[PDB]
Structure formats: C-alpha cells, structure tokens
Design a protein around this ligand. Structure first.
Ligand SMILES: [Cl-]
Ligand SMILES: [Cl-]
Ligand SMILES: [Cl-]
Lengths: 414, 414, 414
C-alpha cells in the first residue's frame, strides 16, 4: 500500500542519484583547472637582464675598404658593379669619403667574416654609455655583456652569467632599479641609400627585458626608446605556472632541448631558425648558435636574410613551439619627458665635449624599475582532486540510498 | 547512564550538523563563481581590425567656396556675418587663398551635405599610405575599408567584411603583424582660427584596435601616434567570458539589439547616441547608422555637437549599457623611436618628392603586433554545482547521524 | 571462505580510505585560496586623485638674493666660497642676472626655510594651468590642492579633501575624464650648472594617479609627460582584496599606523622615511609629516638628501612594509600626438601672448580617462571551507566503511 508506493519513490530516489553521480564523474574527466593569481609587493626580487642595441648596426668611421668591398652591397652602399649607386642620397662631405674608399683601383680583397665585422664596426658600449647607475651604485661597461643579435653587437646588463651574483630589488620606484644615459651617435650612422635588412630609417635603440636564462629576440619582441627623451619603464614580474597533461599542454622547463640549457619559447624559436638556415643555406647568421659556417655577405643577401624573414613573417607551420611549464613575463608601462631642458642643454654639451644640438639629437636616458606591486604569480590549480570526487559521489551515495562499496560488492556476489 | 549521557552527545552531534549543513546551502545560493585565466602562446589567432583617422578632418586644398559657405562657421573660418574673423591667425600666403574663396560676391549657395563633404575633403588613404606590409605581404589602399567616425573619413585595415578572408597570426614579434608608413600631410591641415569640435591643436593620427564585428569609437577609445616617430604597439588578445544570471549580469552577444548584427558595448552606445540625436535634433551625424537626415552644418553647430558632447561627457543615466557575455579586449604596450635618422632623411625626402624638413614633420611608421603570449582567456566558472552541494550535505548527513532521504521521508511518515 | 576472503578486501577497503581521507585533511591545512577576477564596465566609479609636478623645482625669477645665499650651493649655483662656479654653463643674459644677485657685498643673511622657499619659488598652478576640463565642466586652480613632494610645490586634482564631493565616472573614453593643458615654463627653469638632487636635465612634468586617501610618492612611482605632445592615459581601476592569516599575510587597511589615517604601502614608506631622517639628521624634509624642524639647505646637502637616497636606493631591510588587505592599482596605457600642428601654432601663440617656438617647447595637453572595462576586482577566495571538508571526509567515510561519529565514539567506548 503506502509502504510500497514510496518504494516507487525509491525508484525515483534511485533515478536522481544516477544523474547527479554521473555528473561529478564526467566533470572529473574534463580535468578542470582554476587560477590562483597573486599580485604582491615582493622582496629579494631578482632583477631581469636588460639587452639593448643601437638601431644602426655598423659605425661609419669603422667601415673599411675591405669591409665596403665584401659587404657594401648588403648595406646598399654599392650596386652590383661594385660602385656607388648613381641614385645615392648625396652628401658633399660624406660622398667624398665613401667614393674614396670605394676606390678599389689598387685593391685586392682580403679575408672577411660578418662576426668580426659586427664585433669591430658595431657600436661600442664604452662610448655609448655616458652614465649608468643601479640602485645608487654606478655601473661601467664592465657590467654589460656583449651579445650578438640580428641588430649586431648588442649589450646585456645583468646577464647574470660570469658567476657574477645577480642583482636584487626590494621596493617600487626608480631608485630601486637601473638608469642609464646613452649617446646613440647619429654622427656614426651609416648613410642609407637604399632599403635592406641591415639599414633603418629610425634613430634610437631597441630594448628587451628578459630572464637571465632566456635569450633575447630583440628584433621581434623588443621595445624602442627615442633619443632626446628620458623614458621611464615601470615593470612587474609575472610568473606563470601551468599544469602538465592531462590538465594542460605543458613542456618541462628543464627541457632536453638543444642549443640552450633551459627550455623557453624564445630559445625554441632560435633553435629552429638555426636548423632552418643551416639546412637551407649551408650557413648560420652571426647571432645563431652551433658550429656552422657564418654566412658571407652574399649568403646574407641571397639566402640567409629571406630565409629568416620567411620564418618570422610568413611561416605558419615549420617553427611553432610548445608552452613551457614556467613562463616569466614582464608587464611594463612606458612614459617620457624631454631631454635636455634649455636650462641644462649647455651643461651636457660642455660636459661631453659636444654641440648643444648634438645633445638634443643623440642623448637619451632610460629608467627601468618596478612598481610597488612588483611581483605577480599566475598559477593554474587543479579543481577536482580524486579524493574530492569520492567524497562527493560517496556523500551522494549515502544520501539517496545509504550504500557503500561493501554493500555493493558483497551483495553483488552473495 | 553512560549510554544515555552520550545520547546528550547526540544532541550535540545533531547540533553541529545543523550549523555546517546550513552553511554549504546558504553558500550555494550566493551562486559563487571563480576565474579561469590562461595566458598562452596561441596559433591561428585572428588579426583584429585596425581603424585610423587623421586628426585633421578636412583637406585645405579640397575645401571649395560652397564648402566654405555652408560649413565655414563650423570650422571657425567664417564668423556669423559670413566673413573672415578679424581675429584670424594670419598667414600672408594662406590668408590670400581663403579670403579669395570667402568672396561670395558672385556666389549663390548650392546643395550640400556633410557626408559628401567628409567623403570628398577627408584625407585620402591613397595619398597617406606610403607603405603597408602585413606578414611579409604588402598591402594597398584596397586593403583599407572606408569608415566614417566623428573624425570624418577614416580607414579600417582588416575590416574582415567584403567576404575577404580575415588574416591570421602565429608567433610573437613585429614580423607577424602589420607595419604602415604614413604621411599625415600637415600641409593640408586646415587653419585653426578658433576652437570647435572639428578643429584640433594636434598633428598626428588616432588609432583603435577592435574586433572585426565591433564598430569603432575611436574618438573616445582610441590612442594617438605622433609624426616623426616609429611607434611599436605590442598586443595581447584577451577573451573575457562571463556567466549569465543567476551567477552574473550578462547579455547574450547575439543580441537582439538594433543597428548592428552583434551586441557589444560600443555598438550599444552608438545605438543610443543615434536615437538621442534623432529624437532631440531631427538629425543624425554623418557617422551614425539609420535613415534620418544627416545634420546640416548649422544643425551640427547648434544641436548635433552639444547633444553628443553631453552624452559622452555629462550624461550619467541616459545611455548606459549592459555587459555582453563575451568581450574582447586588447592589452597593448607602446614604444617609440625617432624617424628619420640624419642618415636616412635625405633618402626618404628624395624617395617621396618631399623636403627633408617635411619628412620630419609628417612621416610616421606604425607597427602593430602581438607578444609571445598573444592570447588570454578570462572565463568565470561556477564554484558550487548542485551535485557538489548534495555530495557535501549528503556526506555531512552521514557523518553526524548517518541518515538518508529514505530514512527521513519514511520515518517522517511511518 | 569467500565471506572472509573479502573481509581481507575490507582491509584493502579500509586501506584506501586512510590515504584518501588523510589527503583532504592535509589539503585543508595548507589553507589554499583561489582568485575571483572580474573585469567589468562599471558605473558611479570614483575618479582618482591626480598629482603633478614640474620637473623644475624653483622659478628663476622668484629666486632672491637671500634664497641664493642660503640655498645656492644646494642648487649648484654657488660653490663653497659663496660665488659663481667658474665652471658655469654661461649665458650672457642669464649670467649677468645671477652674478648681480650673487653679489653679497652689502648683504647680511636673513631667516630662511625650505618650505617657504618651495611654496614661494615653486611653480604656480595659476600660471601653469592654461586650460582644465573634467567631464564637460571646466576646472580652475581652485580645483587643485597644493601638495609638497620631493619635487617641491605640486598640485592634486580631485584630492577629495575639503569636504568637496569626489567626482564620478560612468563610461569609457576621453570625455568622461580629465583634460588639462599646461605651460611648463622652460623660461623659468633654473640654470643647471651641476648635478644635485634638486636639479634635472629634463623638461616636462611628473604625474601620479592614486587614491584620494593614498599619499603620492611621485618621485619614485610617477610617470612623465613630455612638452610639445598631447598624451592620452587610458586607465582601469583594479581593486585587489587579500585574505588575512592564516590564508595570507595581510594588514588591516584601517591600520593603527601613524602619520596618516589609512594604511597603505606608500604611507608606510613615508612614515619610516620620516622617522629615519628625524633620527639620523634631526631634521625633516619639507614634504614629510610630523613636527620636526625642516632641514636647512645645509642639512639637505649634508644629511637629508643622502639619507633618503639611501632609503630609496640601497636600503634592503630598514623600511620594508607589509601588504594591506585592500590595494587599489591603476593600470594605464599611454599614447601621444604632437602639439601644436603647424595649422594651430599661430593661434595658441597669439592666444597666450607667447612665441610660436615657445608654444612648441612648453605646451602640453594631458588626458586622463578610463576604458570601457574600467573596473576590475581581484579578490582571493577560500578554496576549502571546513564544512566542505567534513562533507568530503564524511562522504568518504560512508563510502568504504559506512561509518559515523556515533558509530566510532560509541564503539570506541562500548
Ligand atoms: Cl621563428
Ligand atoms: Cl554614449
Ligand atoms: Cl623607503
């Protein structure tokens, strides 16, 4: 009667548990994750490496007649007939110089490679660095490590290598970071008579902030700083931590992955780009690792440059990379004031044995620091551990029917 | 005795469950949510639309005598007596021109509307665009769609309309995005003799990065780019996904919402602004949708402009919008280098048949691209599903008393 | 037989529960938290305070002979022998002026303090502010509150004090925020003949956006704005809410913490810096709170400046602060256009009784506003409440063995 009518209710009671229990278990097998994000004022924070490059690759005073012979076409300074292009943007003073050293009348070519050319003609930290300070302590060119990029001879502050103990940061604000004044030396910029991957229309420098154990890809990923300004770059360290499979696609950062000791997206790109160029050009560019022969200027112009341009512009499949388990990003906010003021122009001009106008066109101050909330963690966390599933489906089992595994397994037998 | 003394303990055992069980259930009815945030290096990412506008609305060489008659007051070029204001910022060359075409002696007005004025006198992409490249491929003005904003005749790269397959992005870096060089043509800027909503003190352009299916509100939401610089804009696509009620206030993006096919905040504003202006002015501005008559310059000056200024400045209640369920934000980091260098100035001057000084005052290079971590999802997720509640209150029921719904319902009867 | 063989299975059944139950309970005592992040289009949002400072601390026309006597060395205008340094960056017009008022022949020193010097010689809002507008309403210097920083006499828009009802914001875009035009007055910049903590090589202003109830640390934390540009600063209000112990290190914002009514990182720093300077110099700088005597210029030069420089540069332990429970951050994106255009230069020059060149070197427009998604909450939330633990370990207890606290406690006795 009424006892067996709510036995039908039990079927209904049974009916509910099925839908609910099958829910929490399907949910488990989506392997869901959530995010733990903490922006905080840190302490003992490690200062990143700072790489920079003049936008002018070679120094006009350092370009020799042999340099001009081998690489003059690459720099659009000579046509294919080894002579000054008649379509040159003439300068009565400059043109006199170049066509003097474009005179190969008594000249027989001498051995040449791009790395030495870059290393020699590349702008020098010792004459660009007019002032360096980190946290009240002054830096010297000794504090900048030479690194070659697609820009040429570039420099890294706080590279952290050389067993030199990496620098730390405590508070927010300019005084707890780096400040450097630079002369980009527009008077040493090579004439631009045409468009190549080595010449530029812009004056200034390129900068990139990265981990000490992440190589720079400053050509693609860096930011610019204009001369005649003081630029403030306020940063924030963002540590991103991901979950390995089955919760997410994630590569171990101690990656068993070639040219570098650490796996990072940037290193992964450089790896593939090198393989690609070696494979397709029998040639490596000056900034690439390995042991292939460096490209000759002709190889640069005919093979190396478009090979890399293809990879960084058109390629959609050859050199794509996985995500590491740990990524460090640096948020940044830039800001400018003018340099020099009228009040201070004559001072700097005098101080550096330079024209007042020169100071206006070449001088540049760069501040790199962190805000008060200087550190941020973005860690993915598992949302449904197995134990919590059992506690749920268990706590669900007991509700509608009050069963147990013994109750089932024993009654499933006996 | 001791058996009935821990029957009192049972009351205590009962007492606890009440507080704990009533906790997880109140908690459910707050409908709590948490956040799933994933910054990742994507692939096959869709490149956004890029809208830009010269800050000068009309071209001085294209302003005709009829144009001057109808709209000259709006542009502060004529007073109320249809003549040059005696308080004009004279230019012996320019003033000769204007007062020649401000000569209405033999003139009888001719039909006129703002849309045609804008369309005709508005700066032309075909003469501003000195160079365009996207991912190694060159663009043409063909790749830019004309859009009218409050700035006038503006252009959208990758508008995605026209059945033209939208462009994609794979990696981080400049080469995997857009670069354009522009001449803002300061020699065509109209004289500023007064302050109106059509004139500006600034030279440069306004830019805004948005979804192909989000209209631009570049006047309010855009960023500027200065001439005589190369500006790098490093981006990151942020997809924000919200929960519908009861978990959150959220509007379906396939919104049954007027002038546009998609619901977005921006489209919602433009909707209301149009209704407002039509209602209050019997007039729509040139950039607004619908089928009202366009405002005459007099309607612009007397009714249309302050109507819109009120909406975008003072209004606190008339045109407020709901949140869509999906929002796309683009984080961005800007950065500059100077253009041109001394070394390259003569080249560009020669190349574009322009003065060296001109190049310095009008030329501008813009790079728009994404970083390595180019895609971010910020999705709200439900924190306490019903099933997890039951598993909890169930698992709580079994703890203190070991009950079930059968145990209750049956004993609540029998 | 088979009945007692799955009694061994029960030991196994028992064995599992131990590992699983001990899991959810260890997990509880990590006190884990997750994050609830909501970016939203707000309404009735409170507009922040905006502090700004000219980079030139004193006005050359306001520096008197007594001012020069007392503070001339601090400003590197006089050597230690109270005379013009022979190594001065001469200006035939300026040098005539200074050495006239550096003439102490008939001079006997008069009382002097830095606060009055700053207050008097400091740049004046009433002559810097050429135009102010907030949401369609015009501002006056009346709307700017005087605040002293390490820069000197500075000003705060929307300080929110004075019982003046704080301003609100509704939408995204420039029109729903602040715009001001400034003359930085480079013609009043003091000559820079040397390097001190009071002189600068840069022209422009420093700006910082903060809570009305957070003091400014504009020297360390602010951003710059260059003259001869219009800069757009697009903002987003980020409210960060943390958990108190045991879930996290967190200080109550109604902090029983000295010089200010609210606890914030910035106020905490200023507190310690004042104590430090008072303790070590018997002297407080002009911008510091309390009741110590202000530093004399000699105290500034010998004690006060390096004391503070040490704190903001080298210090790693003395003045470190805890995290408040509530923090307000303002994300921002900057952007520039040039001012003036050729078309408008003559206008502004005429309008402000200034040279055309002057306008180019001193004039500056600043827009501060919010984007569409103007408000963001980043709140840490508890991940495992006690009740959810009990529901889990309870629901786990019932699964493997079907026990209860009664079952245990009673059988643990009887
Ligand atoms: Cl690549
Ligand atoms: Cl609106
Ligand atoms: Cl401090």
């Amino acid at each position: 009667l009424k006892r067996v009518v709510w036995a039908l209710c039990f079927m209904g009671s049974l009916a509910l548990l099925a839908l609910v229990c099958t829910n929490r278990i399907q949910y488990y097998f989506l392997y869901p994750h959530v995010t733990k994000l903490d922006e905080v004022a840190a302490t003992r924070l490690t200062f990143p490496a700072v790489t920079f490059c003049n936008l002018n690759e070679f120094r006009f005073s350092r370009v020799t007649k042999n340099d001009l012979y081998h690489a003059g076409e690459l720099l659009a300074l000579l046509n294919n007939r080894y002579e000054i292009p008649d379509t040159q943007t003439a300068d009565e003073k400059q043109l006199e110089i170049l066509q003097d050293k474009a005179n190969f009348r008594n000249f027989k070519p001498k051995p040449f490679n791009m790395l030495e050319f870059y290393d020699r003609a590349g702008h020098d930290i010792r004459e660009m660095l007019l002032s360096c300070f980190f946290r009240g302590e002054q830096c010297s060119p000794e504090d900048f490590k030479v690194v070659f990029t697609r820009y040429g001879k570039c420099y890294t502050f706080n590279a952290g290598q050389d067993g030199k103990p990496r620098l730390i940061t405590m508070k927010g604000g300019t005084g707890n970071g780096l400040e450097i004044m630079l002369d980009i030396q527009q008077d040493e910029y090579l004439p631009v008579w045409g468009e190549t991957d080595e010449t530029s229309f812009e004056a200034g420098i390129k900068v990139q902030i990265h981990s000490q154990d992440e190589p720079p890809l400053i050509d693609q990923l860096g930011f610019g700083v204009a001369p005649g300004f003081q630029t403030f770059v306020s940063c924030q360290e963002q540590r991103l931590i991901y979950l390995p499979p089955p919760w997410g696609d994630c590569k171990a950062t101690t990656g068993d992955s070639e040219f570098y000791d650490t796996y990072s997206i940037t290193a992964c790109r450089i790896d593939c780009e090198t393989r690609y160029l070696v494979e397709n050009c029998n040639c490596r560019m000056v900034h690439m690792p390995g042991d292939a022969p460096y490209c000759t200027p002709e190889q640069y112009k005919e093979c190396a440059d478009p090979a890399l341009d293809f990879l960084v512009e058109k390629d959609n499949e050859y050199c794509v990379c996985e995500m590491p388990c740990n990524v460090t990003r640096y948020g940044k906010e830039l800001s400018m004031v003018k340099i020099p003021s009228k009040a201070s122009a004559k001072y700097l001009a005098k101080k550096y044995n330079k024209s007042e106008q020169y100071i206006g066109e070449n001088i540049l101050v760069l501040d790199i620091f962190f805000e008060a909330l200087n550190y941020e963690t973005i860690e993915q966390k598992k949302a449904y551990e197995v134990a919590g599933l059992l506690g749920d489906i268990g706590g669900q089992m007991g509700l509608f029917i009050g069963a147990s595994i013994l109750t089932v397994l024993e009654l499933f037998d006996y």
